[PDB]
Amino acid sequence: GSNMGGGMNFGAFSINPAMMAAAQAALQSSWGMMGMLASQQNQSG
Amino acid sequence: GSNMGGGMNFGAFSINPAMMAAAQAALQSSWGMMGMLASQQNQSG
Amino acid sequence: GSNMGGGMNFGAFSINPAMMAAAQAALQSSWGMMGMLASQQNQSG
Amino acid sequence: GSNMGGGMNFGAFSINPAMMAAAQAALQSSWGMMGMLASQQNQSG
Amino acid sequence: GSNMGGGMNFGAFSINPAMMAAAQAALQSSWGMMGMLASQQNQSG
Amino acid sequence: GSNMGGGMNFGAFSINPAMMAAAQAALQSSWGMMGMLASQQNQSG
Amino acid sequence: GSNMGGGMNFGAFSINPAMMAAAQAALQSSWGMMGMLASQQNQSG
Amino acid sequence: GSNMGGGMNFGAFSINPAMMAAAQAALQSSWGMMGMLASQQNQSG
Amino acid sequence: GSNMGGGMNFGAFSINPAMMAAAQAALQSSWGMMGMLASQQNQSG
Amino acid sequence: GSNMGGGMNFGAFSINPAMMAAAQAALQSSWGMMGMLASQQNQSG
Amino acid sequence: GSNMGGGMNFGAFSINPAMMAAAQAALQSSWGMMGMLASQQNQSG
Amino acid sequence: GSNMGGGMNFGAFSINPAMMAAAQAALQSSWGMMGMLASQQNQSG
């Protein structure tokens, strides 16, 4: 069980994420004002 | 079970994400004002 | 079970995501004001 | 089970996503004000 | 089971997505104000 | 069980995260004003 | 010379004005979303 | 010379003005979302 | 010469003005979201 | 020459003005979110 | 020459002005979020 | 020549002004978040 309060952002967020990855499983998620991500990267041997 | 509060953003978000990946499974998700992502990248051997 | 609150964005989001990927499975999703994505990239050996 | 609240965006979103991919399976989805995508890219050996 | 709330966008979204792909299966979907896409790209060996 | 209070940010957050990873499982998530992420990267041998 | 800008009202205005007057000249004008009134009630002795 | 800027009101204005007057000249004007009134009540002795 | 800037009001204004007057000239103007009034009540002796 | 800047009000203004007057000239103006009034009540002896 | 800057009010202003007057000229103006008033009550003997 | 800077008020102003006057000229102006008033009450003998 999880919960988050609500917030207000007046400023302008200039985000410039730059990502690189190399794996058996890879997920790369960039988001702006609000987001939630639940990623289950299952693996065996 | 998950929950998120509601927020208000007056500023203009100029986002410029740049991503590169190399994997057996790859997902790359960029989004603006609001989003949710549940990605199950299942794998065996 | 997941839940998200509602938000209001007055600013104009100029997004310029640029993505590159190389995998057995690849998904690349860019979206503007609101979105949800549930991607199950199943894999065997 | 998933749920999303409703939001209002006054600003004009100029999005310019640019994507490139190379995989056994590839999906590339760009959308504007609202969207949902559930992509199951099944794979065997 | 999935659900989405309703939103209102006053701004004019000038979208210019540009996509390129090379795969055994390829789907590329660009849309404006509202959309949903469920793509099952099945694969064997 | 988790809970978070609500906050207000007047300043404009210019974030420039730059990330690189190399693993059997890799997740890299950059976000702006608000987010939550629960990632279970399961592994066997 | 007079001038007015244009506005947008999403809310539903339930107005219930109740007026009573007793004069040599009487005008009573109730209006909803938009209006202009120029009433010259001239009088002598 | 007069000038007014344009505004947007999301809330629902429930107005209930109640007015009573007794004069040689009487004007009573109730209005909702937008209005202008120029009333010249001229008088002599 | 007069000038006014433009504003946005999210809240719902419940106004309940109640007015009573007794004069040689009387004007009573109640309005909701936006208005301008220029009333010249001229008088002699 | 006069000038006013533009403002944003999130709160809901419940106004309840109550006014009473007795004069040779009387004007009573109640307004909600925005207004301007220029009243010249001219008088002689 | 006059000038005013622009401000933002998050709180809900519950105003309850109550006014009474008795004069040769009387003006009584109550307003909510923003206003300007220039009243010239001219008088002779 | 006059000038004012812009301010932000998070608190909810509950104002309850109560005024009474008796004069040859009377003006009584109550306002909420922002206002300007230039009243010239001219008089002779």
Side-chain angles (χ1 to χ4, degrees), chain C residues 2-15:
Chain C
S2 320
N3 192 3
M4 208 182 189
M8 47 179 150
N9 160 48
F10 319 157
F13 274 43
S14 172
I15 327 183

Side-chain angles (χ1 to χ4, degrees), chain G residues 1 5 7-11 13-14 16 18-20 23-25 27-31 33 35 37 40-43 45, chain H residues 2 4 7-10 12 14-15 17 19-21 23-24 26 28 30-38 40 42-44:
Chain G
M8 47 179 150
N9 160 48
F10 319 157
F13 274 43
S14 172
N16 297 254
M19 290 185 208
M20 277 126 289
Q24 217 167 184
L27 177 136
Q28 299 208 136
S29 284
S30 294
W31 63 83
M33 196 215 164
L37 180 145
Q40 181 167 99
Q41 296 180 17
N42 300 279
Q43 276 216 113
Chain H
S2 320
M4 208 182 189
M8 48 179 150
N9 160 48
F10 319 157
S14 171
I15 327 183
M19 290 185 208
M20 277 126 289
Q24 217 167 184
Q28 299 208 136
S30 294
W31 63 83
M33 196 216 164
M34 298 195 78
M36 297 189 74
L37 180 145
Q40 181 167 99
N42 300 279
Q43 276 216 113
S44 169

Side-chain angles (χ1 to χ4, degrees), chain L residues 3 21 28 44:
Chain L
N3 192 3
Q28 299 208 136
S44 169

Side-chain angles (χ1 to χ4, degrees), chain I residues 3-45:
Chain I
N3 192 3
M4 208 182 189
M8 47 179 150
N9 160 48
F10 319 157
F13 274 43
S14 172
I15 327 183
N16 297 254
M19 290 185 208
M20 277 126 289
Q24 217 167 184
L27 177 136
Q28 299 208 136
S29 284
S30 294
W31 63 83
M33 196 216 164
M34 298 195 78
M36 297 189 74
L37 180 145
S39 162
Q40 181 167 99
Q41 296 180 17
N42 300 279
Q43 276 216 113
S44 169

Side-chain angles (χ1 to χ4, degrees), chain L:
Chain L
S2 320
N3 192 3
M4 208 182 189
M8 47 179 150
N9 160 48
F10 319 157
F13 274 43
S14 172
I15 327 183
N16 297 254
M19 290 185 208
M20 277 126 289
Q24 217 167 184
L27 177 136
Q28 299 208 136
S29 284
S30 294
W31 63 83
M33 196 216 164
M34 298 195 78
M36 297 189 74
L37 180 145
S39 162
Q40 181 167 99
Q41 296 180 16
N42 300 279
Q43 276 216 113
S44 169

Side-chain angles (χ1 to χ4, degrees), chain J residues 18-37:
Chain J
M19 290 185 208
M20 277 126 289
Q24 217 167 184
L27 177 136
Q28 299 208 136
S29 284
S30 294
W31 63 83
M33 196 216 164
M34 298 195 78
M36 297 189 74
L37 180 145

